[PDB]
Tab-separated table of C-alpha atoms and ligand atoms in Angstrom:
chain	number	residue	atom	x	y	z
A	1054	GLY	CA	1.850	-8.505	-18.332
A	1055	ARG	CA	4.645	-8.914	-19.197
A	1056	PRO	CA	5.586	-5.859	-17.447
A	1057	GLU	CA	2.555	-6.212	-15.166
A	1058	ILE	CA	3.083	-9.935	-14.472
A	1059	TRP	CA	6.712	-8.771	-13.441
A	1060	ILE	CA	5.703	-6.105	-11.067
A	1061	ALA	CA	3.182	-8.459	-9.382
A	1062	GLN	CA	5.751	-11.205	-8.886
A	1063	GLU	CA	8.089	-8.820	-7.481
A	1064	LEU	CA	5.546	-7.239	-5.115
A	1065	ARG	CA	4.331	-10.701	-4.036
A	1066	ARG	CA	8.097	-11.780	-3.178
A	1067	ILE	CA	8.680	-8.836	-1.091
A	1068	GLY	CA	5.224	-9.064	0.577
A	1069	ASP	CA	5.667	-12.742	1.515
A	1070	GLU	CA	9.187	-12.000	2.716
A	1071	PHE	CA	7.826	-9.239	4.896
A	1072	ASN	CA	5.075	-11.373	6.177
A	1073	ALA	CA	7.445	-14.223	6.889
A	1074	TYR	CA	9.612	-11.877	8.838
A	1075	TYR	CA	6.990	-10.792	11.260
A	1076	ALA	CA	4.926	-13.971	11.325
B	254	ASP	CA	-19.178	2.186	5.178
B	255	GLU	CA	-16.880	2.965	8.073
B	256	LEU	CA	-14.291	0.375	7.128
B	257	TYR	CA	-13.844	1.870	3.687
B	258	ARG	CA	-13.790	5.341	5.117
B	259	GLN	CA	-11.235	4.364	7.765
B	260	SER	CA	-9.056	2.481	5.361
B	261	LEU	CA	-9.001	5.460	2.799
B	262	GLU	CA	-8.046	7.904	5.661
B	263	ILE	CA	-5.172	5.761	6.840
B	264	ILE	CA	-3.837	5.134	3.369
B	265	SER	CA	-4.270	8.601	2.213
B	266	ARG	CA	-2.660	10.134	5.007
B	267	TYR	CA	0.282	7.867	4.783
B	268	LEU	CA	0.625	8.447	0.972
B	269	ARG	CA	0.223	12.243	1.418
B	270	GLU	CA	2.822	12.475	4.205
B	271	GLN	CA	5.214	10.370	2.059
B	272	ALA	CA	4.636	12.458	-0.859
B	273	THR	CA	4.876	15.932	0.803
B	274	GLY	CA	7.388	14.998	3.595
B	275	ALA	CA	4.997	16.567	6.335
B	276	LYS	CA	2.505	15.239	8.625
B	277	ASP	CA	-1.196	16.043	9.223
B	278	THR	CA	-3.239	17.037	12.368
B	279	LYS	CA	-6.619	15.972	13.185
B	280	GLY	CA	-9.278	6.821	15.732
B	281	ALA	CA	-7.177	5.486	18.323
B	282	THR	CA	-6.847	2.379	16.140
B	283	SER	CA	-6.464	4.679	12.951
B	284	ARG	CA	-3.551	6.613	14.710
B	285	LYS	CA	-1.850	3.515	15.821
B	286	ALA	CA	-2.417	1.958	12.328
B	287	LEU	CA	-0.925	5.019	10.655
B	288	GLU	CA	2.268	4.826	13.253
B	289	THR	CA	2.661	1.284	12.287
B	290	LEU	CA	2.378	2.162	8.512
B	291	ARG	CA	5.123	4.674	8.925
B	292	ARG	CA	7.359	2.178	10.645
B	293	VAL	CA	6.858	-0.763	8.421
B	294	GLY	CA	6.140	1.015	5.081
B	295	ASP	CA	9.316	2.754	5.534
B	296	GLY	CA	11.017	-0.711	6.319
B	297	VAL	CA	9.775	-2.391	3.350
B	298	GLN	CA	11.155	0.488	1.076
B	299	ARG	CA	14.612	-0.366	2.654
B	300	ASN	CA	16.787	-3.014	0.936
B	301	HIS	CA	14.033	-2.884	-1.858
B	302	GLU	CA	14.993	0.596	-3.310
B	303	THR	CA	16.356	-1.047	-6.382
B	304	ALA	CA	13.456	-3.314	-6.881
B	305	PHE	CA	10.747	-0.466	-6.337
B	306	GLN	CA	12.787	1.721	-8.801
B	307	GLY	CA	12.615	-1.164	-11.404
B	308	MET	CA	8.813	-1.741	-10.840
B	309	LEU	CA	8.039	2.019	-11.031
B	310	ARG	CA	10.044	2.081	-14.258
B	311	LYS	CA	8.095	-0.821	-15.697
B	312	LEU	CA	4.636	0.560	-14.411
B	313	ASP	CA	5.243	3.604	-16.833
B	314	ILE	CA	2.557	5.659	-14.961
B	315	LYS	CA	1.774	8.633	-17.175
B	316	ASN	CA	-0.043	10.946	-14.654
B	317	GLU	CA	-1.848	11.030	-11.248
B	318	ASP	CA	-4.899	9.401	-13.082
B	319	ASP	CA	-3.327	6.606	-14.503
B	320	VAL	CA	-4.043	3.999	-12.067
B	321	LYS	CA	-5.666	1.146	-14.115
B	322	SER	CA	-2.324	-0.733	-14.440
B	323	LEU	CA	-1.547	-0.551	-10.814
B	324	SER	CA	-5.031	-1.855	-9.898
B	325	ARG	CA	-4.414	-4.776	-12.339
B	326	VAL	CA	-1.122	-5.521	-10.687
B	327	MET	CA	-2.589	-5.458	-7.202
B	328	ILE	CA	-5.325	-7.784	-8.243
B	329	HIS	CA	-2.792	-10.164	-9.841
B	330	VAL	CA	-0.679	-10.245	-6.715
B	331	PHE	CA	-3.635	-11.736	-4.739
B	332	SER	CA	-4.644	-14.003	-7.552
B	333	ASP	CA	-2.777	-17.070	-6.146
B	334	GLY	CA	-5.429	-17.078	-3.470
B	335	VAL	CA	-3.138	-15.990	-0.635
B	336	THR	CA	-3.795	-12.855	1.562
B	337	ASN	CA	-1.664	-11.506	4.350
B	338	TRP	CA	-0.609	-8.147	5.911
B	339	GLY	CA	2.994	-8.496	4.482
B	340	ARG	CA	1.525	-8.290	0.955
B	341	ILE	CA	-0.940	-5.675	1.986
B	342	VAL	CA	1.800	-3.350	3.597
B	343	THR	CA	3.950	-3.951	0.532
B	344	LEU	CA	1.302	-2.683	-1.842
B	345	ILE	CA	0.784	0.296	0.318
B	346	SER	CA	4.395	1.126	0.591
B	347	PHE	CA	4.810	0.808	-3.306
B	348	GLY	CA	1.695	3.154	-3.514
B	349	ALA	CA	3.666	5.574	-1.468
B	350	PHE	CA	6.811	5.182	-3.646
B	351	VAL	CA	4.516	5.942	-6.670
B	352	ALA	CA	2.953	8.972	-5.155
B	353	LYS	CA	6.445	10.417	-4.293
B	354	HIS	CA	7.297	10.233	-7.874
B	355	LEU	CA	4.159	11.949	-9.042
B	356	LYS	CA	4.892	14.814	-6.848
B	357	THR	CA	8.300	15.039	-8.392
B	358	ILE	CA	7.016	15.491	-11.879
B	359	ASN	CA	3.957	17.843	-10.719
B	360	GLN	CA	3.946	19.348	-7.414
B	361	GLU	CA	0.136	19.813	-7.318
B	362	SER	CA	-0.785	16.142	-7.922
B	363	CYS	CA	-3.491	14.603	-5.915
B	364	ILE	CA	-2.255	11.327	-4.366
B	365	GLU	CA	-6.071	10.613	-3.866
B	366	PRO	CA	-6.783	8.526	-7.069
B	367	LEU	CA	-3.753	6.349	-6.272
B	368	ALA	CA	-5.020	6.022	-2.430
B	369	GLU	CA	-8.510	5.140	-3.720
B	370	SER	CA	-7.145	2.541	-6.066
B	371	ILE	CA	-5.407	0.762	-3.199
B	372	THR	CA	-8.181	1.034	-0.783
B	373	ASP	CA	-10.533	-0.283	-3.449
B	374	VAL	CA	-8.566	-3.456	-4.023
B	375	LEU	CA	-8.108	-3.865	-0.215
B	376	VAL	CA	-11.578	-3.125	1.193
B	377	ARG	CA	-13.644	-4.420	-1.703
B	378	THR	CA	-11.839	-7.609	-2.597
B	379	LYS	CA	-10.698	-8.585	1.090
B	380	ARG	CA	-13.889	-7.339	2.911
B	381	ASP	CA	-14.824	-10.423	4.914
B	382	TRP	CA	-11.044	-11.205	5.555
B	383	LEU	CA	-10.610	-7.682	7.004
B	384	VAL	CA	-13.812	-7.715	9.038
B	385	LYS	CA	-13.101	-11.018	10.518
B	386	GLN	CA	-10.084	-9.561	12.311
B	387	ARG	CA	-11.471	-6.246	13.307
B	388	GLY	CA	-10.003	-4.565	10.247
B	389	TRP	CA	-6.914	-2.499	11.075
B	390	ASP	CA	-6.383	-4.077	14.546
B	391	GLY	CA	-5.151	-7.234	12.629
B	392	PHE	CA	-2.614	-4.943	11.114
B	393	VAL	CA	-1.585	-3.315	14.226
B	394	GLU	CA	-1.198	-6.621	16.019
B	395	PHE	CA	0.661	-8.451	13.204
B	396	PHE	CA	3.331	-5.810	13.215
B	397	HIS	CA	3.363	-5.102	16.815
B	398	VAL	CA	6.955	-4.894	18.398
C	739	NA	NA1	-6.859	13.858	-11.886
C	740	ZN	ZN1	13.005	-9.656	-8.925
C	741	ZN	ZN1	-19.118	-9.638	3.745
C	742	ZN	ZN1	-5.412	-5.189	19.159
């Protein structure tokens, strides 16, 4: 990071949201 | 290594068709995996356009070969110890978003280094997780509607 930490946080947020949506 | 080969094919085809805007011609699971990826990969990019633009800006990718920071990002994503298909598809979809932007700056860019970078994190770091669920069948079934 800090840019790389922020990108990762964002991708994880969307990914878990998208997982939750289909799970 | 059929799993790696299959995974690279699916991911490359998606990234390439996203970047060029045209589909490729010429297994059954790979076809269905690609159809699923089109549907759900396009879906994740929706509502998240602003976030993807923001991430792309911060990534600051200099050229088609500049994949080290993206690889580091993807390893970091999984570093909480959690693995699921929503994260994986989001990583691939962001890869597509990046491949698109590479084509805009240089039309003859190979999307292949990016696709290899993603396939590598996926297959090498989640090998046994993928094998256990018959690979892409896990993906197909998870996103089955
Ligand atoms: Na190159
Ligand atoms: Zn955010
Ligand atoms: Zn193993
Ligand atoms: Zn199945």
